[model samples]
Target: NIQVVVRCRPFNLAERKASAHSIVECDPVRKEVSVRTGGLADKSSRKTYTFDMVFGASTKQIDVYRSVVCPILDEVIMGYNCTIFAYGQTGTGKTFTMEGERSPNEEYTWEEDPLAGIIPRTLHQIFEKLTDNGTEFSVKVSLLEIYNEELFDLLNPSSDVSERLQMFDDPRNKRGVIIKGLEEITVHNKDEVYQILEKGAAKRTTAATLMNAYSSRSHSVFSVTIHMKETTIDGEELVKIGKLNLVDLAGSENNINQSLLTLGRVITALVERTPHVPYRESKLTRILQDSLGGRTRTSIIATISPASLNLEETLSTLEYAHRAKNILNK
Candidate 1:
């Protein structure tokens, strides 16, 4: 089953001075988010929804890492596939919570920056936790971006950023896929992973400019695969493989985005227990078919704005995430 969580970011400077007060409140203790649901004149009416977890405006990046990602990473290390995706509208901290920006001051590198988001922090933790276990392991990572149903490899250094990748079903695994020409870089330490991330991010921006599309309109998936070797007392060798996918999805605003629309349909079909699930309707859903309601352990971080200006989109994101919780996957 997928675990859904909500996070409400603090009001921005413009929104704070706009004279429109906050309409959302988050209670971490109760694992709930409440939104004022009436006209401006009606102050007593409010609606609340409970989730697996909730983060208020005061929640820190490290807190989210420790509470939401720590256990999932542990499971990944134990040879289980896991995925964590961020869902919300643009400008509401979806990217901020996934690929965080550099700190205002230049005192720290991205790997050690206090404002570092999930991708960097998770990569750093992987190296730290694995090397200390006295086991032989290798880490390989790949980044892919989907725009207008076309697939682009963000980590492919030898090819042009505009070149597209082709996907074929894996013959060995029924639900797996093979992305042709996707570059999977091996990293021995945290510094190499940081550089890989920087390169991929630059490619994403360059391709976005060339295509005349904003980066937020596309979905990015960063995957890490870990292979560990162990030897038993009888001198027999064993290998364990695990994968973790960190997804930065497109904005949740209702628009002409076909992939996001198909994602909504996929969620509806799964929740309603329909006979035929349309996994091939969109490329994004096809690549993520396993994570939605398959064998992968999934978690969703639904971000929202505390300001009333984005009330409609916030409610829509919350409702979609709430419905996704009912999907049962083994």
Candidate 2:
């Protein structure tokens, strides 16, 4: 059995109004959730549903990270596989909340580090916990990005997407992305992990749009598989295989008028919640199939804007999240 936790991201005044109530009004007779842009209407004849709030740094990032996320990782360090992911609209701060700001290249060269992101922070916390317990654990990390319907390896020097997908596999002694012939490198400390993160961030694809700068054009996934074997005083051997999947999904489109029809297909596939989710249609969705639609314990922090000007995008985001909330992992 797995546990699901929810956290809210930081919100400004506009954001506050947008997400003021956990659950908003819905059409009762129609049995449909009400998704309005800008503001809600007078409560005359509409039903409503509720949801959990996600917290951000300004709110309770550390507390939620420690209380909700840490315990799950602890279980994984003890040998259970855990998956943690973020979902929301573009420019909502999914990447910012999961992985911190883009690590400065001056501090860590891209040539030396390629795995920069939230995955490293998660590993660091897990290792710290292990050290405090006087226990040693082996960890392997993998970084993958789904873009333009292709999977690319951030750690791979070659930008060939075709070859990258073939590398997914079980971890070896080293730390890195391991897929069959590809070997995942192992890290003993935070510094080593930071190097990987730095390099990866440099390789991630970003584009600028009217809505945002440094916008992620692809969905990125950072994973850490922890291998631990322990012996009790009675000589009982215990082994745990745990995995932490940190996902930064591409933002969904707000107005169909602003995006290509192809993007509409992608959004439809993501929000459909059917068994036959076309994850393979896009790089981001494919890699996240397990966490998003499959049977993996998951968490989603939907980022939204409260400003009325961005109402269409905000409502679209919440609607997408509402559909995602109904998804049952297989």
Candidate 3:
């Protein structure tokens, strides 16, 4: 099954100067969130939404990774496909939370603080667990971005990424969707993986936008495929494969971006017992098909800004996330 958690990030400095007050509140105890301060402040002005879990604005980054994503990582090692995504409008803490604050001098260390983001923390714990169990494994990581409906292999910055890449159903890999000429590199440990992360991140398409000074112009999918060698009771060798897709979708507020809109329709099809699920509508949805409909376990972190000025956009995101929460995917 899938679970959706709502997380509220602290207001940015600009919002603070605007004296923007928080219009959203989260009840982690009850796993619910309420929105308020509409035009008339009537019942419609304020309504509550419930989710699998809710993280308030003050929650720590480590607490988020520990309480929300650790279990998913545990399952991933046991040969399960999992997806964790941060969904929200631009300027909301999606990128901040997904790629937490880090220093170039530090190597997978967050000063014993809870500031490490999900990607780094996941890398840390994956190796930690494997080391403890003395498990022999190899990891292959890849980074790709879909900008303006084109796929760019962030790992291979030298390649001509201006052309759109084609997608195909890889019958060879049950955890499917193959992008021609995408770069995937093998890494032995977290340090090497960090290099891959840094390299690919630098090649991502980013530019200043009205929503934020620097916003991601495309949707990026960072994938880590783990191949572990296990032994059965009969002394037979078994190779277990686990694929984890950590997708950071671009801002959905920009309605002109049909990619996010198609993603919404696909989500609707997934949550319903309809005659058709249009997984072929867009490349992002196509690549995410396995995690959305197959035997994969998925989690969504719905990021939000508590500022008053962006209340309308915030409310739309809230409603969208609320609907996504109702999807009890088997």
Best by TM-score: 1
Tens-place lDDT per residue, model 1, 238-278, is 68899999998888876367788888899899999998888
Task: Give the runs in model 2 whose Cα sits over 4 Å from its true position.
Answer: 1-49, 102-118, 157-183, 205-215, 254-286
- The better-scoring model by TM-score among 1 and 3 is 1
lDDT value for model 2 = 0.54
| Regions more than 4 Å wrong, model 1 | 40-42, 231-238
How well does candidate 3 match the true structure in TM-score terms?
Answer: 0.88
TM-scores for candidates 1 onward, in order:
0.95, 0.67, 0.88
**C-alpha RMSD between model 3 and the true structure:** 3.5
Itemize residue pairs with steric clashes in candidate 1: none
Candidate 1 residue-wise lDDT at 311: 80
Candidate 3 lDDT over residue span 1-330, tens digit each: 568888998877877787776788889999988878564434446778888899998998878888888898888898988898889988788877777777566654553435668887787778888867646898888876776666777687566445457778898976468899887788787667666777665554332221232255578788888899866556667678888888888886753555687889877876775658777777788788777767778888888888776778878787888777656554
How many pairs of residues collide in model 3?
A: 0
Candidate 2 lDDT, 1-330, residue by residue in tens = 223323334455665776654223323234233334334455334323334433332433445465556666766776665576565566666776677554465665522233333454576777677666545578788776655544567766555334546534225632123344333667777658767776675555322221233344566667788877666657666777778777776666532221223434544665564435454444344344465545566666565543345556656566555555555555
